[PDB]
Amino acid sequence: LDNGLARTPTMGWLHWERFMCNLDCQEEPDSCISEKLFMEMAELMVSEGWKDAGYEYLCIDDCWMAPQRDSEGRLQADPQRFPHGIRQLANYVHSKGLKLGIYADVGNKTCAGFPGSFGYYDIDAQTFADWGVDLLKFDGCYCDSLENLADGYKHMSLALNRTGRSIVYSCEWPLYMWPFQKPNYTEIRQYCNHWRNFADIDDSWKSIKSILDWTSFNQERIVDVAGPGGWNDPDMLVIGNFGLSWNQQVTQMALWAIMAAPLFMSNDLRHISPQAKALLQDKDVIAINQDPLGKQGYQLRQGDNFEVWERPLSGLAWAVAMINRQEIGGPRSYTIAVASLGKGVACNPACFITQLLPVKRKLGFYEWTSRLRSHINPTGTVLLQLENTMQM
Amino acid sequence: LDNGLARTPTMGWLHWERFMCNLDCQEEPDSCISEKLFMEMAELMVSEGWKDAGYEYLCIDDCWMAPQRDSEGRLQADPQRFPHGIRQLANYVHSKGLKLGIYADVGNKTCAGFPGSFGYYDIDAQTFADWGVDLLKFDGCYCDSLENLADGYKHMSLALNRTGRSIVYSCEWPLYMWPFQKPNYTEIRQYCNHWRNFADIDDSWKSIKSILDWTSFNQERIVDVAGPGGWNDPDMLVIGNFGLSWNQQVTQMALWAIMAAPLFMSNDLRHISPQAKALLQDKDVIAINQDPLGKQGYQLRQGDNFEVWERPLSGLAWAVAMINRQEIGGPRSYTIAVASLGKGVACNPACFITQLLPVKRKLGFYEWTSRLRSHINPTGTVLLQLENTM
Ligand SMILES: *[C@@H]1O[C@H](CO)[C@@H](O[C@@H]2O[C@H](CO)[C@@H](O[C@@H]3O[C@H](CO)[C@@H](O)[C@H](O[C@H]4O[C@H](CO)[C@@H](O)[C@H](O)[C@@H]4O)[C@@H]3O)[C@H](O)[C@H]2NC(C)=O)[C@H](O)[C@H]1NC(C)=O
Ligand SMILES: *[C@@H]1O[C@H](CO)[C@@H](O[C@@H]2O[C@H](CO)[C@@H](O[C@@H]3O[C@H](CO)[C@@H](O)[C@H](O[C@H]4O[C@H](CO)[C@@H](O)[C@H](O)[C@@H]4O)[C@@H]3O)[C@H](O)[C@H]2NC(C)=O)[C@H](O)[C@H]1NC(C)=O
Ligand SMILES: *[C@@H]1O[C@H](CO)[C@@H](O[C@@H]2O[C@H](CO)[C@@H](O)[C@H](O)[C@H]2NC(C)=O)[C@H](O)[C@H]1NC(C)=O
Ligand SMILES: *[C@@H]1O[C@H](CO)[C@@H](O)[C@H](O)[C@H]1NC(C)=O
Ligand SMILES: *[C@@H]1O[C@H](CO)[C@@H](O)[C@H](O)[C@H]1NC(C)=O
Ligand SMILES: *[C@@H]1O[C@H](CO)[C@@H](O)[C@H](O)[C@H]1NC(C)=O
Ligand SMILES: OC[C@H]1N[C@H](CO)[C@@H](O)[C@H]1O
Ligand SMILES: OC[C@H]1N[C@H](CO)[C@@H](O)[C@H]1O
């Protein structure tokens, strides 16, 4: 989408995975979807270093709406859970130097059952723009026809443009097409800043594996369409929650960097371990994700329960991730000729290699004929950065 | 098995899950299966508080043997990886105040391909006793008949008894029988101190879940036969390794305590986090596992992606575990009438409840009319101890 936005993958926080559709503010006040939750999250995004690391968008997902539209036919926030309304919440978020994202659905209802946007694309777009919204996530539930889906996503893109406000447009169009037909990613790119391809993530290693395996299986189809202004979205980062071991969290961070994924955390910033915070705020890995060249990485090889992925970076640099998919035993040694990496360009005539994950450590100079030797933990990843050099 | 051993579930360390069958001592001298590995673990079991916490058995799994028997037909340890031999390793382990476990197979080969014990049961038992072995894990690979399987496990049990040495006897008899015929656990208990029921564990939450689900599904068959001298073995603790989140490690520790399981760590004692070490050495949770009454717990209910398990303890106390099996979202509240717990006796007329996991905290007095409310992390467990006030 040519709106000048998302020139690097968008970074922020999204409530869905950790908080879902919890409407019980009497019995579960700390977990229900309410304006107080988002205000506190904004405060912590500032005070705990998230904004500095680059996480800019505070995003509301489903279940913010009142059961029905108002007298003028416009959407309204829930009166009990959002008494002061979206405009005042946007003012607060902007006052913290952050941007506000919101959610809607292409069909007649949202996935959770709240008012959909069909028939209201231009007025809903104008409502969001008046409220000060900076990002829209557009879901695809309750729409069982491809023509309606496509026209909806295109229409809402054009309506957002016509409002005149800069709004990141996040689509679930490809995901909802697959039951019917393979998506045309050139068209989707034309209309969207990023697009969900695959099933929702949850707080499990099984889910991470399923997303990685789907991405590598389909990589001929999706890797080259990604770039500044339009990204593949493999769904939220779940680091800092409950279901991933430390090595599995490292794997998710490393591979979302390789994949040029939007980095939308879905966690509770009020209750997050120092280790999880340090990984999510890791300057070098974020710098890989945000690389200005904007070329998505890919799976280079797979075998013997190992995977090697790599991503080209600006200035003849490359990032390389090595995953150990064997879920028994101990760290396994993996060796590869550096000439096999980075299309044979990374280490010609030499490269300096720095390990970034699981720990940062300079590995030294490797000649084009050299071999790289590493040990990789079960379900963990080693992430390396290769800098081309003629020194040595 | 009435040998006077395993009066509480056996606790120790076993190499298999973390170190497997690594024979490459040229490139990986520090992780290959060798006498140096077991010496290093024994040293740390003493120096890092494991023995004090109760972990007593240092166990060799498969891949210790030389490719073939010696001239006199006896098993021998690999000459390169175990140059001083098993008897000398046992002497060292005993000098540290620990006990030594070893591995053999009822059939013609071990699962990894080394000499099996079929045709050699009495000589193998006498060899182990002469070496000073204190525990035998007896695998079931390469056994071509259910009759040979049963006869082997029984014969080896009797041969061990006849050596006169106290040797904990760990069997895989049920596991290898189940695909073909339902096991008779009264018989197995007659011959074994503990028995493997289900597929090998690995370093994953999927494995933990499958073991718990198999145990609860079969619990009418296996819970009541367990007790002092004979335990269900759901396989090793994998806490301290790579595949489990903190909450999943808590779930494994809590549920292995509820199930009166043997506690065999399989990890690297040289590289273990402070948190994992503190969980594995948790005095209150180990005391639940080691409760002298020896009554195995069971799943009380399941629904709404929650499970409740409970275990009766000595002195009118009960342990209660609540698992959140929903793998999305945040801590989820679960409430239950305390009158529903402990068969209606735990909190009649009242009980004092202490949370042990994930953190220790006294919760207070609960009347027979009360309801217990907790928030349980996804894939985590809350473990409680209930003390009747009378
Ligand atoms: C509504 O849709 C229209 C298109 O239908 C869209 O107009 C496009 O806007 C972008 C960005 O505002 C324009 O791209 C710019 O073009 C100028 C020269 O024409 C360049 O100087 C710009 O380069 C800067 O920004 C680049 C990144 O965007 C950087 O790479 C560079 O370093 C510069 O800093 C940039 O290329 C594009 O030309 C128009 N296209 C048309 C057909 O008008 C409009 O913005 C949309 N409006 C809203 C509110 O969404
Ligand atoms: C070979 O098999 C035989 C037959 O099963 C087996 O003999 C059994 O040994 C156990 C343990 O030594 C005996 O159980 C003991 O029985 C006597 C009764 O006179 C009791 O004094 C013992 O007291 C136990 O409990 C005490 C407190 O409660 C403890 O302080 C004490 O240490 C004891 O553990 C206990 O009840 C069992 O009676 C015999 N059975 C027979 C038929 O003799 C023998 O141990 C096996 N040998 C080997 C080497 O495996
Ligand atoms: C399961 O095995 C046990 C032991 O092999 C059987 O129990 C014995 O049964 C014999 C008669 O068949 C009795 O004389 C013994 O007293 C029993 N032993 C014990 C310890 O009770 C049992 O019958 C078998 N069950 C089935 C269903 O075959
Ligand atoms: C919403 O429902 C109306 C009435 O049933 C229907 O005409 C319309 O097609 C639906 N919207 C979509 C996007 O399918
Ligand atoms: C994809 O859409 C673009 C733009 O609408 C179009 O030009 C192209 O023909 C489509 N691709 C295929 C393979 O039909
Ligand atoms: C071991 O092999 C022999 C010879 O093939 C066979 O007769 C015997 O039954 C086997 N034993 C077992 C337990 O499989
Ligand atoms: O109801 C909201 C949910 N519907 C989408 C399905 O992909 C999820 O991402 C989340 O937004
Ligand atoms: O070869 C050794 C392996 N065989 C057993 C099969 O259950 C495992 O526990 C482990 O001991």
CSV table of C-alpha atoms in Angstrom, one decimal, chain A residues 2 10 46 49 57-58 64 84 91 115 118 137 178 200 208 211 214 284 289 292 340 342 345:
chain,number,residue,atom,x,y,z
A,2,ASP,CA,1.4,3.3,-1.2
A,10,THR,CA,5.2,-1.8,12.2
A,46,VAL,CA,6.6,4.9,28.0
A,49,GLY,CA,11.4,1.5,27.6
A,57,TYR,CA,1.4,1.5,18.2
A,58,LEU,CA,-1.0,0.6,21.1
A,64,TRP,CA,-14.3,-2.7,22.2
A,84,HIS,CA,-14.8,8.3,28.0
A,91,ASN,CA,-5.8,11.9,23.0
A,115,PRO,CA,-21.2,-4.6,14.7
A,118,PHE,CA,-20.3,-3.8,5.6
A,137,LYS,CA,-6.8,-4.0,11.8
A,178,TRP,CA,-7.6,-19.7,1.4
A,200,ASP,CA,-4.0,-17.2,14.7
A,208,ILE,CA,5.3,-21.3,16.5
A,211,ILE,CA,3.6,-20.8,11.5
A,214,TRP,CA,3.6,-22.9,6.8
A,284,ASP,CA,20.5,-5.6,17.5
A,289,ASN,CA,13.8,-6.7,11.8
A,292,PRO,CA,15.9,-0.4,5.7
A,340,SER,CA,27.0,-21.5,1.5
A,342,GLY,CA,24.4,-15.2,2.0
A,345,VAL,CA,28.4,-12.9,-1.2
